[PDB]
Symmetry: D2
Subunit: 240 residues, 4 copies
């Protein structure tokens, strides 16, 4: 993954969990990583230290990407700082509460779909021209990676229907983006985490077991001929 050195990678929802672990793993190969959350972390400089300690660089950008204006602002701020985008990682998302169908109102639907649907759509939209520029300059490809879910495939847990559907939504919109943007040499791939006795490996995954898949999809040398794919990382929980 020597081709990740100096690559400018914007990761949404990356101050904790999978996003932060991915940021660090990418930074180990010299990536320049834009961290993001809707809230300021306790110690932003510490996160930056971990990126630089690993061998890369970066910055933290606060932005609430449930709002389209904020997606625009985040992309513009990242490009102002680093002069472009080589990889976008759509990682921000989540359940945003649980509700059986009969208790779902407009507010609940809006909340879940803004977090998991509108955010990914608009982040990607605003990143496209920068990703297009990146691939043109490098003569290789640029990349989008999005965090999917097992729930996209088998409906998710009771009360998590809208969330599950939003991930199926994501998995399929990537297929559309392959059709539109492969001509621009932009690749699109998904890492789909699982959720214990329904898991063949008999345990939940750790963030360290998720990060390498993102690194793989980020590197043109590793995955340059790979686009429109979903790699499920779930200890065998589903074998699609």
């Amino acid at each position: 993954f020597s081709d990740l050195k100096g690559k400018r990678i914007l990761i949404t929802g990356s101050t904790e969990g999978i996003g932060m672990a991915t940021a660090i793993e990418l930074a180990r190969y010299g990536a320049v990583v834009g961290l993001n959350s809707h809230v300021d972390p306790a110690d932003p400089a510490l996160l930056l230290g971990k990126l630089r300690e690993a061998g890369g660089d970066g910055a933290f950008f606060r932005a609430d990407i449930t709002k389209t204006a904020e997606c625009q602002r985040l992309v513009s701020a990242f490009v102002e700082r680093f002069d472009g985008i080589d990889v976008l990682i759509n990682n921000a998302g989540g359940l945003a509460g649980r509700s059986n169908l009969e208790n779902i109102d407009d507010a609940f639907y809006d909340r879940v779909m803004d977090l998991n649907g509108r955010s990914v759509l608009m982040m990607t939209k605003f990143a496209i021209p920068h990703l297009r520029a990146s691939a043109k300059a490098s003569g290789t490809t640029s990349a989008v990676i999005s965090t999917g879910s097992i729930a996209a495939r088998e409906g998710g847990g009771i009360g998590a229907g809208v969330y599950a559907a939003s991930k199926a939504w994501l998995h399929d919109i990537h297929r559309n983006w392959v059709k539109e943007f492969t001509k621009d040499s932009i690749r699109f791939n998904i890492v789909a985490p699982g959720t214990a006795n329904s898991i063949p490996m008999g345990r939940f995954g750790t963030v360290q077991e998720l990060a390498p898949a993102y690194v793989f999809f980020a590197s043109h040398a590793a995955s340059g001929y790979i686009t429109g794919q979903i790699l499920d990382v779930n200890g065998g929980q589903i074998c699609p």
Copy 2:
């Protein structure tokens, strides 16, 4: 399909296309069909005449189901007329325009997702109580049938990404509803049309032509009948001339 006689079937978006053809075919087996559109058909009496001539009955209910309040109102109106719901057919939906990703704004996203996402969610939400009651009274099952799409599987055409995604959204939410509502003896199935009535799309179809609405309706009849499909739930039947073989 003799077990469809008297069954009360609410079909959203059924004044034209697949919905109207399905309504007529169900009426042939004596179904009582609720026709619906967001706008008034120019003569509802004629459409209802066709249902009765086929051998069934029904009524027309105007409701713009992109609005949650309208979904509640439509279910209430149908239940006011027929006291209950035995089958809900979520057929309303559509592209609502095309846009390359870089031209998509909030309005475009909201429009497509209200038409294909919010609508089916809220229609199903408001119908489920009645479907539950229906199944309990009959001792068999009640049914939800939703119109999906090939685009749920392979991303749809350029400009149709949000539509495509909204259909994948539907296909997967049905899987969730199987988990929640199979205990209430409610079945959930999808008919996923390919291309229904250009040369390039036809060449991508092994049968070399687009489908007709008459070729779509029988799949809905099959999924509506407990006798035919009583042990079938959580499934998608693609009707597409071989355009995709999933």
Copy 3:
């Protein structure tokens, strides 16, 4: 399903279970049904009586379709009797024993694949020219229906790996046949039965709940624009 009247339907493995139930249901719409098993049933005339009582007709043909020569003989015998084939139903198949991977030898592999693979391949092969002729004469379509399985999708039970794989094999070869033979107006579809607490409906299916799907796929009026599809009949056991 009024267009099934007089349709000549050859069903392999149809003296018991799904095959016999399907034969009867088709006969209710006036179909002429060729029954088949590798062994003579106790009372062949009784089965014929059930077809005729339902409203159709038929005959019983004994043939061991694990052997290609027997597939040829069965097709030739059916056509000798009824002058053609309008629908082929590949229903013969089954586990043929259970074996964990380490105990699988050539004999086991051969047994399972002859029953589930070679049989379907060769039955369909020998039927094609008759199915081609049927569709040309009717001006509509002729049809192949094959019995698949949930096991094609999720690997089957422990010890049933070769069986499970043979069903995935079937599901995919149908996709190839769509490409080759749609130009001949021959349709190909699959009914995929499930196998209790892993089943949302909380029970196993009955043969009566399986038969209608076959009738649906057999009728041009019902499924004339449907080819290359799999309808899983499994009480929600998998929602693919």
Copy 4:
């Protein structure tokens, strides 16, 4: 991928194409690679020289793995040389001809299914005991990686039906092996190439060209490394320039 140093990786069909490229890329991380072909390469010393120049080691083993006896013999030979197996890569396979269905005879069926079905079954069968022992000794996982195909998903080209089916067979038997062998800390994953090195096939690929073997190898390296993919089993990674997006 530092955890690949010294790992003993048996790759069937690895004197050319994807197998040879994968062998070399693994050797770069210090792997000990068993090269195999059903026929003798014209100079094995040269191929082994490339493995050592890359930074690894290995040996060549001739075996026609369409025969079960040869599968046993190959595993025995590799284990005789290196005492065990840490990763098995089932890469041997291929069309073995094309035939329209009406021209397929028993010989055609047997040939394709021995090459793509029987071979992978028996190679995996004979390797599993050693993979089990390997995982126990290391305290991590051992791995099986098998070469699948786009044809497993969408039926393959005209004439390639049995090949296509044999790859679907493989994709699904891996799912069974996850159920049986995850308890032994053996992982099972598939790399499914699309088209690897005509104008019509290229136009069906969004990237507008066939893949190269160098673009396939990294996926195998990823699946071979417990550090990279230790929580990944029962998966298929398609490497196809967008030809199918499953």
